[PDB]
Amino acid sequence: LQIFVKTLTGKTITLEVEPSDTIENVKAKIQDKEXIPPDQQRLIFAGKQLEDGRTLSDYNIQKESTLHLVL
C-alpha cells in the first residue's frame, strides 16, 4: 500500500506500508524519514484521530490515502 503523510509545513512524505500496519509502525516510518519523534506525532485521516495500537485497515485507509500530522 502506498500512503502519503503531510507534515505541519505541508511537506509530503510517501510511505510503503501493509494494510494491517499499526499506526505505531507508521510513526516509526515517519521518524526515519523526517526526524519527528513518535510521541510528538498526532495523525488524522478524514477527520479521525488515529490511535497507535490500531491498524490502517481499522480506519479504512487505502491506496494513496493522505494522513496529516497535526498539533
| Closer Cβ to Cl ion, 19 or 49, answer by number | 19
Q: Which residues contribute to the site for Cl ion (CB under 5 A)?
A: 18, 20-21
Would the CA dihedral through 62, 64, 31, 10 be positive or negative?
negative
Say if CB 26 and CB 15 are below 8 A apart.
Answer: yes
Query: Do 43 and 25 contact (CB within 8 A), yes or no?
Result: no
Residue number with CB closer to Cl ion (20 or 49): 20
CB of 61 to Cl ion, least distance (A): 13
Q: Smallest gap, in angstroms, from Cβ of residue 56 to Cl ion?
A: 9
- Residue 56: burial class (beta carbons within 10 Å; 0-12, 13-18, 19+): buried
Of 18 and 70, nearer to Cl ion (C-beta) is 18
Kindly state the smallest distance separating residue 57's Cβ from Cl ion, in Å.
9
